[PDB]
Symmetry: C2
């Protein structure tokens, strides 16, 4: 019981998601600490941390114990969780695993990370942008993880209430295999025009090193094609969700994730497979013609996403599209 | 005085193709080829069960041994392939006052990996939900035995065995299938590859197996994507690239040519494949290489009718 407990506090009852770095499945603190004499006091420490937004040091003289709490606060000021440690008074707590708050605005189709969430996921914070991120910048390219279907489902057909806890395999920027835990929860939050946004709020952390059978993934990899870049997209909004191959440099998908037109307004009407040439935002010019091939993927019953294959259009293809 | 049931009470299915008889089912519950001397360690009747299995293997016959002095009944049933080879023995034992439960019926089958041809039994077909009045037991393509579209654990290893056969490998698993009428079922199976005499002086590589209907009881993004890539009129399959043997259907099988044909009897092209009513039929084929294991490849083929233009392009007459 000497470890730091990571508690997600966006539900009705605070719920444990990490003991040290080991994942726990959103276990309500009263269940996780059912047989604990410090349960009542722990609940109070967390409750006050939510109130004050402050790191607290609480003492219970009766049991000669101290409770220490660390808020996990997103850069919009929102409390995503609280990290808690208890034990004897003059005892020194263990090194604290750094939790990384992030959020996905599903209405905007845009992610906001933190230096902490980026570092945990093994990216180089000195060279990373925290805001205006495409969802496909937070998900790995090509590699698949447990319950990734539910993440994508969470994103395309937004319904509040849905929560997810998982451990994922990643590779950091130095090439090293790593693992992360995370918790994520979707909810409706008030937006600018009196219209509510659907937003998924999350925390990750670097997990312990512990590291397969996937015929479909081997087949999918075999379908890769030079010059062609596959991705999952939100059909309704053209929000980019995930790269299945490496990202394409044909167009500026990163800048246009949060800023400007996602496609040419004249091609808006254009958006069994379907194929067409679409003008997407350029790096140096306004518009770049890209040949797009689209299939509907069913993630959950009545929940669909777009499988898009992107490549440069031929001179011939440009002509048929009515483009010079 | 109900005497104690034995550890064999649910019937043990014992695979007998290795060095020592090894348990692969207790009732319908899968066991991972556990040596009978491990599985029944400390059973007073272990020696008698081993003897019963040996006697069944030798006689090829069902056996019932009743020994009042040990208050013991032992029952064995052979699991014999239609070529006379024993794949396993099912054994029950108990005190004289016990009654054996219903015996789960095992289905022996074999894959000749050298030929690319499977031989099933009505038992193995029935267990895996096929219709034995319409299925032919002999001369089967491996794609008639693997489920269409549905994927299962370690199926990658089964496919690797077909394309790059090796002896001395075993696989024990529980698979989820649907029978030919749409009803979900589960099966267990054990399989073991080995070298056997061949007809023309050279060994064949043969995998011998038994299945059984398992007790009724997924996370796969790639599978969902693969399914979304299905196209009307297009039928996808995995093939052995070396021999063009059909290994597995990823969509429902197609009718416009005789894919079941044995040799007895990204890249694209119109290929002539065996016909039903005629000798050859033109088929448009798109092929991708799939890596199943390191240095172990199969082909993914997309099969569809060719267009008149594609026919002319291929220099093929109508």
């Amino acid at each position: 019981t000497h470890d730091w407990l990571l508690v997600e506090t966006l539900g009705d009852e605070p719920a444990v998601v990490a003991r040290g770095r080991e994942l726990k499945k959103l276990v309500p603190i009263t269940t996780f600490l059912r047989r604990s004499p410090y349960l009542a006091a722990v609940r109070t420490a967390i409750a006050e941390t939510l109130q004050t937004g402050q790191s607290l040091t609480s003492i219970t003289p009766k049991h000669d114990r101290v409770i220490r709490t660390e808020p996990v606060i997103m850069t919009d000021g929102r409390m995503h969780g609280v990290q808690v440690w208890s034990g004897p008074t003059d005892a020194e707590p263990p090194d604290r695993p750094i939790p990384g708050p992030l959020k996905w605005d599903l209405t905007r189709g845009v992610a906001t990370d933190t230096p902490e969430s980026l570092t945990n996921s093994g990216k180089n914070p000195e060279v990373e942008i925290t805001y205006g991120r495409a969802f496909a910048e937070d998900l790995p390219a090509r590699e698949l993880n447990p319950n990734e279907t539910q993440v994508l489902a969470m994103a395309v057909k937004a319904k509040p209430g849905k929560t997810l806890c998982s451990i994922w395999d990643l590779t950091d920027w130095q090439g090293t295999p790593i693992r992360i835990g995370f918790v994520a929860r979707s909810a409706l939050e008030p937006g600018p025009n009196g219209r509510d946004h659907l937003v998924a709020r999350a925390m990750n952390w670097r997990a312990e090193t512990k590291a397969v059978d996937d015929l479909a993934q081997r087949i999918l990899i075999g379908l890769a094609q030079a010059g062609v870049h596959r991705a999952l997209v939100d059909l309704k909004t053209w929000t980019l969700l995930k790269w299945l191959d490496q990202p394409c440099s044909f167009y500026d998908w990163r800048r246009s994730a949060a800023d400007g037109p996602r496609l040419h307004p004249d091609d808006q009407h254009v958006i069994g497979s379907a194929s067409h040439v679409l003008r997407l935002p350029g790096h140096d010019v306004d518009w770049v013609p890209v040949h797009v091939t689209v299939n509907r993927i069913e993630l959950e019953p009545d929940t669909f996403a777009g499988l898009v294959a992107l490549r440069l259009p031929t001179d011939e293809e440009l002509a048929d599209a009515g483009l010079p």
